[PDB]
Coordinates of N, CA and C in Angstrom, one line a residue:
Chain M
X1 N -59.1 -73.9 29.9 CA -58.6 -73.6 31.2 C -57.5 -74.7 31.6
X2 N -56.3 -74.3 31.9 CA -55.1 -75.1 31.7 C -54.3 -75.3 32.9
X3 N -54.0 -76.5 33.2 CA -53.1 -77.0 34.2 C -51.9 -77.9 33.8
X4 N -50.7 -77.4 34.0 CA -49.5 -78.0 33.5 C -48.4 -77.9 34.6
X5 N -48.3 -79.0 35.3 CA -47.4 -79.1 36.5 C -46.5 -80.3 36.4
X6 N -45.6 -80.4 35.4 CA -45.0 -81.7 35.0 C -44.1 -82.3 36.1
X7 N -43.4 -81.5 37.0 CA -42.7 -82.0 38.1 C -43.3 -81.4 39.3
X8 N -44.3 -81.9 39.9 CA -45.0 -81.4 41.1 C -44.7 -82.2 42.3
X9 N -44.0 -81.5 43.2 CA -43.6 -82.0 44.5 C -44.2 -81.1 45.6
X10 N -45.2 -80.2 45.3 CA -45.8 -79.3 46.2 C -46.4 -79.9 47.4
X11 N -46.5 -79.1 48.5 CA -47.0 -79.5 49.8 C -48.6 -79.5 49.8
Chain L
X1 N -60.5 -78.4 29.1 CA -60.0 -78.1 30.4 C -59.0 -79.2 30.9
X2 N -57.7 -78.8 31.1 CA -56.6 -79.7 30.9 C -55.8 -79.9 32.2
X3 N -55.5 -81.1 32.6 CA -54.5 -81.5 33.6 C -53.3 -82.4 33.2
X4 N -52.1 -81.9 33.4 CA -50.9 -82.5 32.9 C -49.9 -82.5 34.0
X5 N -49.7 -83.5 34.8 CA -48.8 -83.6 36.0 C -48.0 -84.8 35.9
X6 N -47.1 -85.1 34.9 CA -46.5 -86.3 34.7 C -45.6 -86.9 35.7
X7 N -45.0 -86.1 36.6 CA -44.2 -86.5 37.7 C -44.8 -85.8 38.9
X8 N -45.9 -86.4 39.5 CA -46.5 -85.8 40.6 C -46.2 -86.7 41.9
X9 N -45.5 -86.1 42.8 CA -45.3 -86.7 44.1 C -45.8 -85.7 45.2
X10 N -46.6 -84.8 44.9 CA -47.2 -83.8 45.8 C -47.9 -84.3 47.0
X11 N -47.9 -83.6 48.1 CA -48.5 -84.0 49.3 C -50.0 -83.9 49.3
Chain N
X1 N -62.1 -82.8 28.4 CA -61.5 -82.5 29.7 C -60.5 -83.6 30.1
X2 N -59.2 -83.3 30.4 CA -58.1 -84.2 30.3 C -57.3 -84.4 31.5
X3 N -57.0 -85.7 31.8 CA -56.1 -86.1 32.9 C -54.9 -86.9 32.5
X4 N -53.7 -86.4 32.8 CA -52.4 -87.1 32.3 C -51.4 -87.0 33.4
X5 N -51.2 -88.0 34.2 CA -50.3 -88.1 35.4 C -49.5 -89.3 35.4
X6 N -48.7 -89.6 34.4 CA -48.1 -91.0 34.2 C -47.2 -91.5 35.4
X7 N -46.5 -90.7 36.1 CA -45.8 -91.0 37.3 C -46.4 -90.2 38.5
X8 N -47.5 -90.7 39.0 CA -48.2 -90.1 40.1 C -48.0 -91.1 41.3
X9 N -47.2 -90.6 42.3 CA -47.0 -91.2 43.6 C -47.4 -90.1 44.7
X10 N -48.2 -89.1 44.3 CA -48.8 -88.1 45.2 C -49.6 -88.7 46.4
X11 N -49.6 -88.0 47.5 CA -50.2 -88.5 48.8 C -51.7 -88.4 48.8
Chain U
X1 N -34.0 -80.0 14.2 CA -35.2 -79.2 14.0 C -36.3 -79.6 15.0
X2 N -36.8 -78.7 15.8 CA -37.5 -79.1 17.0 C -38.9 -78.5 17.1
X3 N -39.9 -79.4 17.4 CA -41.2 -79.0 17.8 C -41.8 -79.6 19.1
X4 N -42.1 -78.7 20.0 CA -42.5 -79.0 21.4 C -43.7 -78.2 21.8
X5 N -44.8 -78.8 21.7 CA -46.1 -78.2 21.9 C -47.0 -79.0 22.9
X6 N -46.5 -79.1 24.1 CA -47.1 -80.1 25.0 C -48.6 -80.1 25.3
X7 N -49.2 -78.9 25.3 CA -50.6 -78.7 25.5 C -51.1 -77.8 24.4
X8 N -51.4 -78.5 23.2 CA -51.8 -77.8 22.0 C -53.3 -77.9 21.8
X9 N -54.0 -76.7 21.9 CA -55.4 -76.6 21.6 C -55.6 -75.6 20.5
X10 N -54.6 -75.3 19.7 CA -54.6 -74.3 18.6 C -55.6 -74.6 17.5
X11 N -56.1 -73.6 16.8 CA -57.2 -73.7 15.8 C -56.6 -74.1 14.4
Chain I
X1 N -34.9 -84.7 14.2 CA -36.0 -83.8 13.9 C -37.3 -84.3 14.7
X2 N -37.9 -83.4 15.5 CA -38.6 -83.8 16.7 C -40.0 -83.2 16.8
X3 N -40.9 -84.1 17.1 CA -42.3 -83.7 17.5 C -42.9 -84.3 18.8
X4 N -43.3 -83.4 19.6 CA -43.7 -83.6 21.0 C -44.9 -82.8 21.3
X5 N -46.1 -83.5 21.2 CA -47.4 -82.8 21.4 C -48.3 -83.6 22.4
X6 N -47.8 -83.9 23.6 CA -48.5 -84.9 24.5 C -49.9 -84.7 24.8
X7 N -50.4 -83.5 25.0 CA -51.9 -83.2 24.9 C -52.2 -82.4 23.7
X8 N -52.9 -83.0 22.8 CA -53.2 -82.3 21.5 C -54.7 -82.5 21.2
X9 N -55.5 -81.4 21.3 CA -56.9 -81.3 21.0 C -57.0 -80.3 19.8
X10 N -56.0 -79.9 19.1 CA -55.9 -78.8 18.1 C -56.8 -79.1 16.9
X11 N -57.4 -78.1 16.3 CA -58.4 -78.2 15.2 C -57.7 -78.6 13.9
Chain O
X1 N -35.9 -89.4 13.8 CA -37.1 -88.5 13.6 C -38.3 -88.9 14.4
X2 N -38.9 -88.1 15.2 CA -39.6 -88.5 16.4 C -41.0 -88.0 16.4
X3 N -42.0 -88.8 16.7 CA -43.3 -88.5 17.1 C -43.9 -89.0 18.4
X4 N -44.4 -88.0 19.2 CA -44.8 -88.3 20.6 C -46.0 -87.5 20.9
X5 N -47.2 -88.1 20.8 CA -48.5 -87.5 21.0 C -49.5 -88.3 21.9
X6 N -49.1 -88.6 23.2 CA -49.8 -89.6 23.9 C -51.3 -89.4 24.2
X7 N -51.7 -88.2 24.3 CA -53.1 -87.8 24.4 C -53.5 -86.9 23.2
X8 N -53.6 -87.5 22.0 CA -54.0 -86.8 20.8 C -55.5 -87.1 20.5
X9 N -56.3 -86.1 20.6 CA -57.7 -86.1 20.2 C -58.0 -84.9 19.2
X10 N -56.9 -84.4 18.6 CA -56.9 -83.4 17.6 C -57.8 -83.7 16.4
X11 N -58.4 -82.7 15.8 CA -59.4 -82.9 14.7 C -58.8 -83.3 13.4
Chain H
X1 N -34.1 -82.5 44.4 CA -33.1 -82.2 43.4 C -33.5 -82.6 42.0
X2 N -33.6 -81.7 41.1 CA -34.5 -81.9 39.9 C -33.8 -81.8 38.6
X3 N -34.1 -82.8 37.7 CA -33.7 -82.8 36.3 C -34.8 -83.1 35.3
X4 N -34.9 -82.1 34.4 CA -36.0 -82.0 33.5 C -35.5 -81.5 32.1
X5 N -35.2 -82.5 31.2 CA -34.6 -82.3 29.9 C -35.4 -82.9 28.8
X6 N -36.7 -82.5 28.6 CA -37.6 -83.3 27.9 C -37.3 -83.5 26.4
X7 N -36.5 -82.7 25.8 CA -36.0 -82.9 24.4 C -34.5 -82.8 24.5
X8 N -33.8 -83.8 24.9 CA -32.4 -83.8 25.1 C -31.7 -84.5 23.9
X9 N -31.0 -83.7 23.1 CA -30.1 -84.1 22.0 C -28.7 -83.7 22.2
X10 N -28.3 -83.4 23.5 CA -27.0 -82.9 23.9 C -25.9 -84.0 23.6
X11 N -24.7 -83.5 23.3 CA -23.5 -84.3 22.9 C -22.9 -85.0 24.1
Chain T
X1 N -35.5 -87.1 44.3 CA -34.6 -86.8 43.3 C -35.1 -87.2 41.9
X2 N -35.2 -86.3 40.9 CA -36.1 -86.5 39.8 C -35.4 -86.4 38.5
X3 N -35.7 -87.4 37.6 CA -35.2 -87.4 36.2 C -36.3 -87.6 35.1
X4 N -36.4 -86.6 34.2 CA -37.5 -86.5 33.2 C -36.9 -86.1 31.9
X5 N -36.7 -87.1 31.0 CA -36.0 -86.9 29.7 C -36.8 -87.6 28.6
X6 N -38.1 -87.2 28.4 CA -39.0 -88.0 27.5 C -38.6 -88.2 26.1
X7 N -37.9 -87.3 25.4 CA -37.3 -87.4 24.1 C -35.8 -87.3 24.3
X8 N -35.1 -88.3 24.6 CA -33.7 -88.3 24.8 C -33.0 -89.1 23.7
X9 N -32.3 -88.4 22.8 CA -31.4 -88.9 21.8 C -30.0 -88.5 22.0
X10 N -29.6 -88.0 23.2 CA -28.3 -87.5 23.6 C -27.2 -88.5 23.4
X11 N -26.0 -88.0 23.1 CA -24.8 -88.8 22.8 C -24.2 -89.5 24.0
Chain A
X1 N -37.2 -91.5 44.2 CA -36.2 -91.2 43.2 C -36.7 -91.7 41.8
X2 N -36.8 -90.8 40.8 CA -37.7 -91.0 39.6 C -36.9 -91.0 38.3
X3 N -37.2 -92.0 37.5 CA -36.8 -92.0 36.1 C -37.8 -92.2 34.9
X4 N -37.9 -91.2 34.1 CA -39.0 -91.1 33.1 C -38.4 -90.7 31.7
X5 N -38.2 -91.6 30.8 CA -37.5 -91.4 29.5 C -38.3 -92.1 28.4
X6 N -39.6 -91.9 28.2 CA -40.4 -92.7 27.3 C -39.9 -92.9 25.9
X7 N -39.2 -92.0 25.3 CA -38.6 -92.1 24.0 C -37.1 -91.8 24.2
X8 N -36.4 -92.8 24.7 CA -34.9 -92.8 24.8 C -34.4 -93.6 23.7
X9 N -33.6 -93.0 22.8 CA -32.8 -93.6 21.8 C -31.3 -93.0 21.9
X10 N -31.0 -92.5 23.1 CA -29.7 -92.0 23.4 C -28.6 -93.0 23.3
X11 N -27.3 -92.6 23.0 CA -26.2 -93.4 22.7 C -25.6 -94.0 23.9

């Protein structure tokens, strides 16, 4: 189960 | 189960 | 189970 | 010649 | 000639 | 000629 | 404003 | 403002 | 403002 958010600036 | 967030500035 | 956040300045 | 497999869980 | 496998749990 | 595997736990 | 060039061999 | 060039061999 | 170039051999 995979999470890949290399440039995360999310609120 | 994987987390990869190398540039995380998220709120 | 993996964590990789090398530039984390998240709030 | 390019290899880019950032989240590799292959058998 | 390039190899980039930052998360690698492959068999 | 390049190798980059910062989280390698491959078998 | 975002730059993401993970394998850059550009001239 | 974000810069991410992990394998940069550019000229 | 972020800079991330872990394998920079650029000219």
